[PDB]
Amino acid sequence: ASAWPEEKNYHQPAILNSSALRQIAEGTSISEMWQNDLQPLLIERYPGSPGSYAARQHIMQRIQRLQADWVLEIDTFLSQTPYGYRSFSNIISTLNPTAKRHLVLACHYDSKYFSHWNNRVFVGATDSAVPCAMMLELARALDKKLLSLKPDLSLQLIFFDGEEAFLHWSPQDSLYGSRHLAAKMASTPHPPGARGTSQLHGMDLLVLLDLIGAPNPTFPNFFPNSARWFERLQAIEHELHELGLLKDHSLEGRYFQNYSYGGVIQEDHIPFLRRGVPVLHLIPSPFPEVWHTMDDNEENLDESTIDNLNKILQVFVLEYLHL
Numbered sequence: 525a526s527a528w529p530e531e532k533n534y535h536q537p538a539i540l541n542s543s544a545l546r547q548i549a550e551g552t553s554i555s556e557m558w559q560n561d562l563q564p565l566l567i568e569r570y571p572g573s574p575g576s577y578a579a580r581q582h583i584m585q586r587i588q589r590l591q592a593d594w595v596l597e598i599d600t601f602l603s604q605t606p607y608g609y610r611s612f613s614n615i616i617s618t619l620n621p622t623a624k625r626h627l628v629l630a631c632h633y634d635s636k637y638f639s640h641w642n643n644r645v646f647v648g649a650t651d652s653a654v655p656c657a658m659m660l661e662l663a664r665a666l667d668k669k670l671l672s673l674k675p676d677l678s679l680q681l682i683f684f685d686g687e688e689a690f691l692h693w694s695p696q697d698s699l700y701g702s703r704h705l706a707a708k709m710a711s712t713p714h715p716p717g718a719r720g721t722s723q724l725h726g727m728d729l730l731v732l733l734d735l736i737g738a739p740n741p742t743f744p745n746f747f748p749n750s751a752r753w754f755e756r757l758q759a760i761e762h763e764l765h766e767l768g769l770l771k772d773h774s775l776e777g778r779y780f781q782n783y784s785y786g787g788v789i790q791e792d793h794i795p796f797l798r799r800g801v802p803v804l805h806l807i808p809s810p811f812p813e814v815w816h817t818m819d820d821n822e823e824n825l826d827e828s829t830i831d832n833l834n835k836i837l838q839v840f841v842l843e844y845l846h847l
């Protein structure tokens with residue numbers, strides 16, 4: 525009876541030295557992400573809408589153009605909603621599908637449904653078009669390093685559909701894509717042929733990005749079983765800062781601060797956390813002031829903060845994967 529699902533408990537990062545940190549800082553481009561990955565997603569994209577299809581095609585196309593061996597799968601399902609039965613499609617992008625373990629980065633790509641108001645349209649820029657673009661930029665920036673994976677451990681990106689409630693939050697009306705996918709992964713043997721382990725046992729850590737893009741975010745350390753990885757984000761932030769690799773940044777105004785958070789936040793990690801998956805939830809507390817308003821738009825995004833977080837995230841991922 526292999527103990528491989530316990531490996532994640534002892535897994536340590538392979539820390540990057542100063543020269544490598546400068547390389548990562550120089551290898552990501554916030555302006556290229558902005559134009560090529562983010563702007564195409566700043567459209568109305570609630571589930572089942574024409575924009576939802578356009579956002580999915582954009583995400584799939586940007587991944588497909590990369591050199592690394594990404595395997596794309598669309599998880600399409602039906603769910604009851606306040607508006608009746610509807611179809612949803614989660615996007616899963618995986619390197620080394622048969623590898624036993626994967627570090628997983630995730631966000632939701634749907635935008636909350638609102639009828640147009642005074643000619644304004646809700647596009648959910650921080651919620652979560654920026655997180656989606658950050659994941660696409662990370663795949664692009666780290667492409668040459670990721671190509672080398674072609675520790676039986678690799679990387680998977682998940683873009684959930686239907687995270688938002690169609691009305692206001694309720695247990696049945698929200699998290700459509702993550703409740704579906706967590707249940708599906710929980711009942712899928714992994715690796716192929718396994719007798720008693722599932723895809724969820726293979727998820728080392730689920731790093732969920734949500735509501736990112738506003739100024740001065742503060743991310744609390746929510747869970748004790750991922751606290752040591754939260755500490756790594758703090759250390760990476762501190763060292764990139766000391767190396768002069770972050771922009772418009774101070775340690776007093778650091779993003780990853782020492783402090784827990786006892787409450788529960790309804791978000792896509794919930795169905796995974798309730799099935800025993802370790803989660804590192806990168807959602808700020810408090811939420812962006814523009815949360816769920818028409819002002820959650822491009823103009824209110826903080827470019828340097830997103831750039832700094834791209835650098836921190838990319839370093840975290842390379843160190844976790846020993847790349």
Ligand SMILES: [Zn+2]
Pocket residue numbers: 636651688816
């Ligand atoms: Zn939202």
